[PDB]
């Protein structure tokens, strides 16, 4: 579970494990795929997707997911998590605002991202309905058995941990997690690399002038922009994405039927939608003479139909056609 710098972490820029990168309000189904720097899913070892492992300290905390909250302008709905990554059904929102509850603390993370949800169709809803026609939307999956893409996930760079740099009663005293690789020296001249167990520091004294580092590359990370490079190498760790964008047919929009009214080679149409509906036509002469107008306000319109025919498209309701001799 990677940890990075959340931008407006409740107060201001903290370093949250759930630091939000790559917000994708690019689908249609009320859904956003998000990456936390935290890797929830199974535990550290082997069990139960519905548990929760973020970083506390240098360490993980692979425990229950109890009170996740993604949210935006309104509280979102989770869809599924896998890896670093969560899918959640959100409404539109100027921002994105994520957070669980460990239990002692709220411990959330928030971010800017322009979000919208147009459904696919000539109706510009704000939200998916219960009914209407199905038609080919873009949307992310529920599932994990997924390989359609993979993002590079090589090592972490080092990280700071000044909990290490204690004092040896006059000298600044570094320690190690588990024998991990601590990269160490101070502004003064003393040990210059640091690949060690718990060292002391002969020369410097102040904690604030030393290299508290953790080369702990036993587990790779996501290659966040808010990661410091592991300077050594491009290690392996090519790793999939679960939530591929797929060609789901969203349960989708439908605009109320029109009121057809006859006139001489002319369609008066008293019209009354639910939401802004893009109407348009095609006078089937080799003179096309089409028309487009989003209609949200109910409006009686007109169409000079010709002899050979016109067609009529009340939103994603199917196209009509008309003989006006």
């Amino acid at each position, epitope marked *: 579970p990677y940890i990075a710098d959340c931008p407006n972490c409740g107060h201001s820029r903290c370093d949250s494990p759930i630091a939000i990168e790559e917000v994708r309000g690019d689908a249609h189904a009320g859904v956003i795929r998000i990456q936390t720097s935290a890797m929830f899913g199974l535990k550290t070892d082997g*069990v139960d997707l519905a548990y929760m492992s973020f970083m506390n300290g240098k*360490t993980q905390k*692979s425990i229950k997911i109890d009170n996740l909250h993604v949210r935006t302008s309104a509280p979102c709905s989770l869809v599924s998590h896998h890896g670093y990554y969560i899918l959640a059904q959100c409404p539109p929102g100027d921002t994105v605002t994520v957070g669980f509850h460990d239990g002692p603390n709220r411990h959330t993370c928030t971010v800017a991202h322009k979000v919208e949800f147009r459904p696919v169709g000539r109706e510009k809803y704000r939200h998916p309905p219960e009914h209407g026609v199905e038609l080919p939307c873009n949307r992310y999956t529920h599932k994990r058995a997924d390989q359609g893409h993979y993002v590079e996930m090589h090592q972490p760079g080092l990280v700071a941990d000044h909990s290490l740099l204690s004092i040896h009663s006059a000298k600044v005293k570094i320690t*190690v*997690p*588990s*024998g991990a*690789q601590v990269k160490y020296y101070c502004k003064c001249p003393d040990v210059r690399e640091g690949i060690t167990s718990s060292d002391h520091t002969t020369t410097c004294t102040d904690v604030k002038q030393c290299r508290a580092y953790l080369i702990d590359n*036993k587990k790779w990370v996501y290659n966040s922009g808010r990661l410091p490079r592991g300077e050594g190498d491009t290690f392996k760790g090519k790793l999939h994405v679960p939530f591929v964008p797929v060609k789901a047919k969203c349960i989708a929009t439908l605009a109320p039927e029109p009121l057809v009214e006859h006139k001489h080679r002319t369609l008066i149409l008293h019209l009354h939608p639910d939401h802004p509906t893009l109407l348009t036509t095609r006078s089937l002469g080799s003179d096309a003479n089409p028309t487009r107008q989003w209609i949200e306000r109910p409006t009686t319109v007109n169409f000079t139909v010709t002899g050979e025919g016109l067609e009529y498209t009340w939103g994603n309701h199917p196209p009509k056609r008309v003989w006006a001799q």
Partner: antibody
Amino acid sequence: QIQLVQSGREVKNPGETVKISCKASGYTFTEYPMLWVKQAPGKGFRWMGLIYTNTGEPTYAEEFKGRFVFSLEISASTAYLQINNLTNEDTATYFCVRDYFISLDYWGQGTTLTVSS
Amino acid sequence: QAVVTQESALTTSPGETVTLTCRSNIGAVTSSNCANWVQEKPDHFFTGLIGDTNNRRSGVPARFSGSLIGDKAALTITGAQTEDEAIYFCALWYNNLWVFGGGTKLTVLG
């Protein structure tokens, strides 16, 4: 059911190499990786690392990155510990162990090395 | 770079309830430390008891249960038996490696 039976105890003069085998029985090798633990005469128990018996990647504890090398005769359900350029203070007992159930569930019998000229 | 601490020795009598604890030097022990309890009987004989704080290995008597008490992992033997006289070690996970405690020598009347 699960038996991890280890090689017998060796004697080796400083500088030598040793390959300690751990032959696994009762489980499907591949879904459970191996922990190598050092219980040094006085000092108590210490994690030496873990090997992904599926991919084959080893993790070493920092104390063990270097002279220690984990490998596996996959094919025969064996994991092996190799300690090269034996130092005299490596006399101790090494256990293989199965990582499962959010911890370790089965331990082997131990292979004790006595580094001595 | 973390130090697990355990009681040194504990003495009980057959039939009693005894608790062993496992303390982490970095902070409270939590479920993401996946406390493990291992028993060492004489002859370099190791068996795992509990894993992931409270999962009892299969074929380990029910008198054994694990939990978190306060800020530490605990092992309770309910109805200790003479057979339980051994060394109990706790192990804690720290995001990338395992740290073992010093072990508790438990003595049971019998």
